[PDB]
Amino acid sequence: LQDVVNQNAQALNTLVKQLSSNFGAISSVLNDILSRLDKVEAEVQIDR
Amino acid sequence: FRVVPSGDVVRFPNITNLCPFGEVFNATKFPSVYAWERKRISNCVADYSVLYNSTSFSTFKCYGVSATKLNDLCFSNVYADSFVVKGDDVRQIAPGQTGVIADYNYKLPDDFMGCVLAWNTRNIDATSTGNYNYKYRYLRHGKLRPFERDISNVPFSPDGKPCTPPALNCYWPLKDYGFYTTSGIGYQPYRVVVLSFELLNAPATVCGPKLSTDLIKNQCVNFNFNGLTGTGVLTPSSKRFQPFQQFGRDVSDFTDSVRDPKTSEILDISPCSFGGVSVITPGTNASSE
Amino acid sequence: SVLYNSTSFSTFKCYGVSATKLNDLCFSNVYADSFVVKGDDVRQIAPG
Amino acid sequence: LDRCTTFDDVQAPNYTQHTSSMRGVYYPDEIFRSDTLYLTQDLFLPFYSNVTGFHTINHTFDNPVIPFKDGIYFAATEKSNVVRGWVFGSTMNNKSQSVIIINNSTNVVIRACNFELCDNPFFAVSKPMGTQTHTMIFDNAFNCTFEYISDAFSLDVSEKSGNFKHLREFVFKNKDGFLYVYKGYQPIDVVRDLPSGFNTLKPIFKLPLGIKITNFRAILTAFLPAQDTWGTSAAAYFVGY
Ligand SMILES: *[C@@H]1O[C@H](CO[C@@H]2O[C@@H](C)[C@@H](O)[C@@H](O)[C@@H]2O)[C@@H](O[C@@H]2O[C@H](CO)[C@@H](O[C@@H]3O[C@H](CO[C@H]4O[C@H](CO)[C@@H](O)[C@H](O)[C@@H]4O)[C@@H](O)[C@H](O)[C@@H]3O)[C@H](O)[C@H]2NC(C)=O)[C@H](O)[C@H]1NC(C)=O
Ligand SMILES: *[C@@H]1O[C@H](CO[C@@H]2O[C@@H](C)[C@@H](O)[C@@H](O)[C@@H]2O)[C@@H](O[C@@H]2O[C@H](CO)[C@@H](O[C@@H]3O[C@H](CO[C@H]4O[C@H](CO)[C@@H](O)[C@H](O)[C@@H]4O)[C@@H](O)[C@H](O)[C@@H]3O)[C@H](O)[C@H]2NC(C)=O)[C@H](O)[C@H]1NC(C)=O
Numbered sequence: 312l313q314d315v316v317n318q319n320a321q322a323l324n325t326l327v328k329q330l331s332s333n334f335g336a337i338s339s340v341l342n343d344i345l346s347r348l349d350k351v352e353a354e355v356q357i358d359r
Numbered sequence: 360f361r362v363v364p365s366g367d368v369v370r371f372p373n374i375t376n377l378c379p380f381g382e383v384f385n386a387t388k389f390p391s392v393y394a395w396e397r398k399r400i401s402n403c404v405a406d407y408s409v410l411y412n413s414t415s416f417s418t419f420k421c422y423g424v425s426a427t428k429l430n431d432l433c434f435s436n437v438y439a440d441s442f443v444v445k446g447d448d449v450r451q452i453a454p455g456q457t458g459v460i461a462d463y464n465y466k467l468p469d470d471f472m473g474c475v476l477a478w479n480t481r482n483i484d485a486t487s488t489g490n491y492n493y494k495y496r497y498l499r500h501g502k503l504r505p506f507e508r509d510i511s512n513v514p515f516s517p518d519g520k521p522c523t524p525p526a527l528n529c530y531w532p533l534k535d536y537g538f539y540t541t542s543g544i545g546y547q548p549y550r551v552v553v554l555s556f557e558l559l560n561a562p563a564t565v566c567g568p569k570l571s572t573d574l575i576k577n578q579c580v581n582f583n584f585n586g587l588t589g590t591g592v593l594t595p596s597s598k599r600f601q602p603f604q605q606f607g608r609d610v611s612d613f614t615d616s617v618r619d620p621k622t623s624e625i626l627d628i629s630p631c632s633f634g635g636v637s638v639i640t641p642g643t644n645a646s647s648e
Numbered sequence: 649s650v651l652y653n654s655t656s657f658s659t660f661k662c663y664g665v666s667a668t669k670l671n672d673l674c675f676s677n678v679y680a681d682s683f684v685v686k687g688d689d690v691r692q693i694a695p696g
Numbered sequence: 697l698d699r700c701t702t703f704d705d706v707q708a709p710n711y712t713q714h715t716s717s718m719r720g721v722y723y724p725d726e727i728f729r730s731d732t733l734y735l736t737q738d739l740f741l742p743f744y745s746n747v748t749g750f751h752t753i754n755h756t757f758d759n760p761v762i763p764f765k766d767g768i769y770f771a772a773t774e775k776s777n778v779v780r781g782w783v784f785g786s787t788m789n790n791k792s793q794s795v796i797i798i799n800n801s802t803n804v805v806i807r808a809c810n811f812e813l814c815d816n817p818f819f820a821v822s823k824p825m826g827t828q829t830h831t832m833i834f835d836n837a838f839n840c841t842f843e844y845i846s847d848a849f850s851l852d853v854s855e856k857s858g859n860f861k862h863l864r865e866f867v868f869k870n871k872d873g874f875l876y877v878y879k880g881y882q883p884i885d886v887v888r889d890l891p892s893g894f895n896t897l898k899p900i901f902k903l904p905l906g907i908k909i910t911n912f913r914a915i916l917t918a919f920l921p922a923q924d925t926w927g928t929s930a931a932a933y934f935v936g937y
């Protein structure tokens with residue numbers, strides 16, 4: 312039972328932690344990208 | 360549960376002086392490319408529209424930022440590099456170029472952030488008899504690293520051993536530009552200024568023209584701190600930043616803390632939307648409630 | 649680099665390779681095409 | 697003296713071997729973080745690396761030319777302010793530009809120029825009077841490109857007796873025309889060694905010099921009892937890559 316609980320918690324926490332991946336973009340922070348680049352250039356990074 | 364913002368907050372540092380556009384772009388004397396010169400810019404407002412009445416640039420290109428966003432940002436570590444080149448050499452001042460200038464005189468890094476400006480100066484830098492005061496290096500052992508300068512003047516030998524000018528296989532490494540009033544456009548003199556800076560990672564003292572507003576707390580608002588824009592709720596924070604720290608991030612790389620540029624108080628930033636919602640229905644054809 | 653003492657080019661553009669790598673490579677089937685055009689037509693010598 | 701001087705009889709230096717121990721960590725950027733673990737790749741000093749030690753005592757005056765490679769960790773153990781700064785360059789003469797970073801007991805001075813460097817640069821202090829007398833770092837300078845001078849202060853130059861009390865740690869990097877300098881400090885009560893421990897360094901300088909750095913030399917202090925005689929006092933410094 313403890314294993315079941317731990318597995319669920321770890322899955323959710325890993326999902327939260329994966330938000331810091333760049334995925335090949337210049338940055339993983341949306342606000343930084345939208346503050347530096349105009350619509351056309353920002354669209355590529357946001358799509359990635 | 361969704362919450363929409365109901366306010367606007369813009370906070371920039373206290374700045375009053377205009378940036379020294381005249382001292383940089385209208386200086387009487389410029390250096391040679393092999394001895395390019397660097398100057399620091401700080402504590403000023405980057406309102407470049409004042410140049411619209413007096414200046415005209417043939418080259419203007421920016422890297423790492425869009426030209427239409429410049430007016431909304433603040434810039435961290437601003438440097439201006441000035442020098443003079445030939446008309447045909449202006450294309451070499453860009454990342455990833457080769458040639459005599461890019462190899463032995465002035466090189467930009469691959470991940471360059473900043474802007475390059477260049478304009479023609481035949482009227483002031485060329486003479487009917489020929490001006491030979493500008494020089495560049497055309498012989499060297501190996502290429503320059505980014506933003507590296509070399510102002511040595513030593514006799515050069517392909518064998519890479521000490522030499523004496525009059526001896527055979529001995530050359531002076533510097534060469535003179537010849538600028539005449541009747542030269543073709545490719546051989547006319549051009550003045551070049553390269554601006555380099557960093558964005559949204561550290562304290563800044565150079566900002567664009569923008570009106571700063573009051574601080575609204577405990578409310579969902581749009582905010583702009585030193586050019587970093589977003590939406591959220593601002594609250595007083597118990598964190599203690601170092602003097603060299605401006606922003607704070609959490610494990611997910613979301614900007615969650617910020618120092619106020621005017622009062623220096625630390626503030627936490629939280630999202631506006633939060634909470635689960637469910638809808639119970641007996642079926643549309645039974646009722647719409 | 650021997651051209652640095654005598655020649656100057658107003659246009660120089662490379663495709664399929666980075667200009668900074670040229671010194672490190674060997675080239676298989678090398679051809680040079682020469683001709684003369686007008687100043688306004690130089691922009692037309694490019695793919696597409 | 698008012699010109700470059702070489703000490704008559706100085707013992708040859710046999711450099712000592714030591715190990716670092718979880719020393720030389722610094723803040724990688726300017727972002728604030730708390731209660732977390734951060735993984736990053738950068739130029740660091742590997743744990744338990746071999747480090748080379750140089751000393752000043754009796755007639756030993758160790759200040760050779762040390763290669764720079766890809767940046768250094770520099771530690772100084774002292775009690776009477778013997779180590780005063782560094783000179784960084786490539787040829788270490790007036791054929792190329794060099795940068796001097798010194799503390800001359802009143803201000804911190806950073807200057808990049810074509811220096812006519814003395815092969816034996818030092819500050820002069822009088823053992824009886826206990827005051828700074830001469831500065832003999834360079835004979836001439838021209839074509840200066842960068843200068844920085846700090847606010848005035850006061851430094852205790854007099855000699856001291858006992859055990860080493862102060863450990864001062866620095867990290868030096870060179871990248872994209874910038875010289876990065878990180879600093880840290882620690883009290884100690886050691887006799888003769890590089891203390892083991894852990895201490896993070898903070899950024900203090902990002903100098904836009906744009907020079908090539910491949911060699912460096914330390915600037916020391918000589919406690920001369922009188923004219924024509926030179927004294928060394930006790931101090932040590934260690935280098936790692
Ligand atoms: C943008 O810049 C213009 C032009 O600036 C002038 O030219 C440049 C190249 C530099 O040399 C500047 O130093 C010059 O000032 C500015 O307009 C000029 O403003 C000045 C200052 O107010 C005006 O000078 C006054 O103008 C009156 C007389 O003007 C009449 O005669 C002149 C011929 O001499 C003629 O050009 C003009 O049309 C009028 O018929 C008078 O008060 C006084 O004697 C003095 O000469 C000057 O006339 C203006 N020039 C023009 C073409 O309008 C702008 O002010 C500047 N804008 C901003 C927002 O800064
Ligand atoms: C790079 O190219 C330069 C220039 O080459 C010359 O100019 C080009 C346009 C072509 O016409 C070439 O054929 C020319 O040679 C070379 O430098 C020149 O080298 C030559 C050969 O050694 C030098 O000629 C000798 O120089 C001495 C006298 O020079 C004095 O007078 C001249 C008057 O013009 C003056 O310019 C110079 O400064 C001296 O005061 C002497 O030995 C002998 O009589 C003969 O004239 C010539 O002087 C050089 N020119 C310059 C400007 O330095 C480089 O060798 C070449 N580099 C490499 C690596 O190949």
Ligand SMILES: *[C@@H]1O[C@H](CO[C@@H]2O[C@@H](C)[C@@H](O)[C@@H](O)[C@@H]2O)[C@@H](O[C@@H]2O[C@H](CO)[C@@H](O[C@@H]3O[C@H](CO)[C@@H](O)[C@H](O)[C@@H]3O)[C@H](O)[C@H]2NC(C)=O)[C@H](O)[C@H]1NC(C)=O
Nearest residue numbers: 700787788789790791810811812813814815835836837838
């Ligand atoms: C750069 O500095 C050198 C001296 O530097 C020394 O030599 C270098 C080659 C390196 O090994 C350095 O580490 C070393 O410290 C200056 O050299 C100077 O050369 C001139 C002649 O060109 C000498 O003039 C002579 O000097 C004495 C004076 O008493 C007498 O022999 C003669 O009357 C004559 O004047 C000068 O002494 C010498 N300086 C020295 C050896 O220290 C060089 O001039 C300098 N360059 C510049 C541009 O300043």
Ligand SMILES: *[C@@H]1O[C@H](CO[C@@H]2O[C@@H](C)[C@@H](O)[C@@H](O)[C@@H]2O)[C@@H](O[C@@H]2O[C@H](CO)[C@@H](O[C@@H]3O[C@H](CO)[C@@H](O)[C@H](O)[C@@H]3O)[C@H](O)[C@H]2NC(C)=O)[C@H](O)[C@H]1NC(C)=O
Nearest residue numbers: 799800801802803804805806807828830831845846847848
């Ligand atoms: C520590 O060093 C500072 C800084 O001086 C700088 O570095 C020295 C090693 C020399 O190369 C100096 O030329 C260089 O500026 C010393 O304080 C400074 O001393 C200089 C003189 O050496 C002062 O300049 C002079 O000041 C007046 C006019 O104001 C006139 O005598 C001269 O025209 C000259 O300009 C300078 O004002 C002074 N302070 C500053 C902030 O620059 C300091 O004396 C020295 N300390 C020790 C113990 O050696």
Ligand SMILES: *[C@@H]1O[C@H](CO)[C@@H](O[C@@H]2O[C@H](CO)[C@@H](O[C@@H]3O[C@H](CO)[C@@H](O)[C@H](O)[C@@H]3O)[C@H](O)[C@H]2NC(C)=O)[C@H](O)[C@H]1NC(C)=O
Nearest residue numbers: 390391393394395492509510511512810837838839840841
């Ligand atoms: C680095 O320092 C060197 C050595 O001081 C500088 O070279 C020197 O520059 C001066 C000023 O241009 C030269 O004097 C001039 O020479 C001719 C006549 O000979 C003429 O242009 C002027 O009338 C004046 O006299 C001087 O000859 C020259 N010295 C040497 C040994 O070449 C050099 O300019 C400095 N470099 C930088 C990038 O600042």
Ligand SMILES: *[C@@H]1O[C@H](CO)[C@@H](O[C@@H]2O[C@H](CO)[C@@H](O[C@@H]3O[C@H](CO)[C@@H](O)[C@H](O)[C@@H]3O)[C@H](O)[C@H]2NC(C)=O)[C@H](O)[C@H]1NC(C)=O
Nearest residue numbers: 711713745746747748749762763765768769934935936937
């Ligand atoms: C810690 O020990 C290592 C070796 O385990 C030292 O590195 C070695 O340093 C020497 C002297 O600089 C290097 O030899 C020299 O290298 C270059 C050519 O590569 C050149 O200067 C000379 O021709 C000579 O060969 C040696 O290569 C290098 N070895 C390794 C594996 O990097 C290191 O210096 C020691 N640490 C300290 C602080 O002394």
Ligand SMILES: *[C@@H]1O[C@H](CO[C@@H]2O[C@@H](C)[C@@H](O)[C@@H](O)[C@@H]2O)[C@@H](O[C@@H]2O[C@H](CO)[C@@H](O)[C@H](O)[C@H]2NC(C)=O)[C@H](O)[C@H]1NC(C)=O
Nearest residue numbers: 370371372373374375571572573574619620621622623624
């Ligand atoms: C940045 O400036 C603010 C605002 O200064 C006030 O308003 C300006 C428009 C101008 O009229 C100034 O002279 C005013 O003082 C500073 O905020 C003030 O800080 C002082 C510090 O003693 C405090 O007494 C005031 O109450 C503050 N005013 C407000 C409206 O909050 C602020 O200190 C400046 N920041 C820096 C770093 O200099």
Ligand SMILES: *[C@@H]1O[C@H](CO[C@@H]2O[C@@H](C)[C@@H](O)[C@@H](O)[C@@H]2O)[C@@H](O[C@@H]2O[C@H](CO)[C@@H](O)[C@H](O)[C@H]2NC(C)=O)[C@H](O)[C@H]1NC(C)=O
Nearest residue numbers: 459497534537543546649650651652653654655656657682
């Ligand atoms: C390109 O060639 C021209 C002349 O064409 C021929 O090739 C030369 C190398 C040389 O042999 C010429 O005589 C030939 O006609 C060169 O220009 C002339 O070069 C000669 C060399 O003797 C010289 O006396 C003239 O003054 C030069 N004339 C001009 C107007 O410059 C030119 O140098 C060659 N380019 C290179 C890079 O070698």
Ligand SMILES: *[C@@H]1O[C@H](CO)[C@@H](O[C@@H]2O[C@H](CO)[C@@H](O)[C@H](O)[C@H]2NC(C)=O)[C@H](O)[C@H]1NC(C)=O
Nearest residue numbers: 380381382384385386387409410412413414415
């Ligand atoms: C750059 O500065 C020079 C020098 O001050 C300015 O040249 C002046 O031009 C005016 C006419 O516009 C002349 O009457 C003056 O004699 C010139 N020199 C001086 C010293 O006043 C030049 O206009 C400036 N350029 C810009 C773009 O502002």
Ligand SMILES: *[C@@H]1O[C@H](CO)[C@@H](O[C@@H]2O[C@H](CO)[C@@H](O)[C@H](O)[C@H]2NC(C)=O)[C@H](O)[C@H]1NC(C)=O
Nearest residue numbers: 707751752753754755756757888928929930931
């Ligand atoms: C440095 O000089 C000191 C004296 O100032 C030396 O210490 C003496 O060494 C001798 C020879 O071994 C001993 O007999 C004395 O008893 C020592 N005196 C003291 C006060 O310790 C020392 O050996 C010299 N060498 C070094 C490396 O410090």
Ligand SMILES: CCCCC/C=C\C/C=C\CCCCCCCC(=O)O
Nearest residue numbers: 457458459651657660670675678680
């Ligand atoms: C005669 C042609 C020789 C064949 C060349 C072979 C392979 C292609 C590689 C390099 C060619 C470089 C072109 C000249 C660059 C000049 C640069 C400048 O001056 O800015």
Ligand SMILES: *[C@@H]1O[C@H](CO)[C@@H](O)[C@H](O)[C@H]1NC(C)=O
Nearest residue numbers: 707708709710751755756757
């Ligand atoms: C050299 O090593 C000896 C021991 O072998 C040591 O006593 C001496 O101090 C070392 N050199 C110097 C300059 O101290």
